[PDB]
């Protein structure tokens, strides 16, 4: 069983057009209490309903900071962003080289690394068992994993090598930029792909990890088990290992295969659904909000 599965939704900013910025199709009622949102007369209830006005910092301290504590205690954690293309999934997870953006725009990734490094260094006040931080960067393109940090980022990995990909040591949270830069210049991107940057925290006898998952939004237009294979697999997993058991379908997809060591008992899984405020994307927003409902239900 998974220690906890949380669902969060973040409304994308409304792009003004010729100075005019129309109202969002997404609504947050006075009783939302930071957990519910109304769309198309449908009110969805989640653990976190963030309006486009929320800042990176506020979204991080509420949604991720908690997980950092769990990671340092030794638990496996995973934060996954999914949703329609252009809704700020990449922006929110912080997949772009930090030194290239402004502080108030930094995403989860660098913010989490700052807290991890701060608390780990906080253990120097009482220098005890040595600790080491690592980072791995994996890309998924056409149901095939690619180690963007190795010397063969062009060669598709195997089911075994996946949980063995290269882990580069991090002495300072500032080493992040390097890792992200190298990975970007090694990725394949069909022309759309998923990314997984895992922050590893290891001791002489323990290995905990925090997976930052940045799913790509579908490419093109859709016709007027019908979405991301990975998404379906995670729910199928959570549900499976959530009553009986006995063979968890980690092999149903590369995503659940790569995150197999994290999608275990007492681990943590958090979804961050990104939706568009535009009306022309209603069909997409509802589909995205409904999956999250399924995910929640899977318990
Ligand atoms: N809250 C925000 N504040 C300021 N800019 C934002 C915000 N959210 C989204 N953007 C901008 O919107 C653009 C797209 O963000 P992005 O994360 O790449 O969408 P995306 O979901 O990753 N697209 P895709 O990879 O095809 O699914 C970038 O310029 C972001 O900086
Ligand atoms: Mg992206």
UniProtKB/Swiss-Prot annotation:
ATP binds at residues 83-90. Residues 4-296 form the Kinesin motor domain. Disulfide bonds: none annotated. In adult female, found in meiotically active ovaries. It is found in: Cytoplasm, Cytoskeleton. The nod(DTW) mutation is a cold-sensitive recessive lethal mutation. Required for the distributive chromosome segregation of non-exchange chromosomes during meiosis. May be a microtubule motor required to hold distributively 'paired' chromosomes at the metaphase plate until anaphase. Belongs to the TRAFAC class myosin-kinesin ATPase superfamily. Kinesin family. This is Kinesin-like protein Nod. The lineage of its organism: Eukaryota, Metazoa, Ecdysozoa, Arthropoda, Hexapoda.
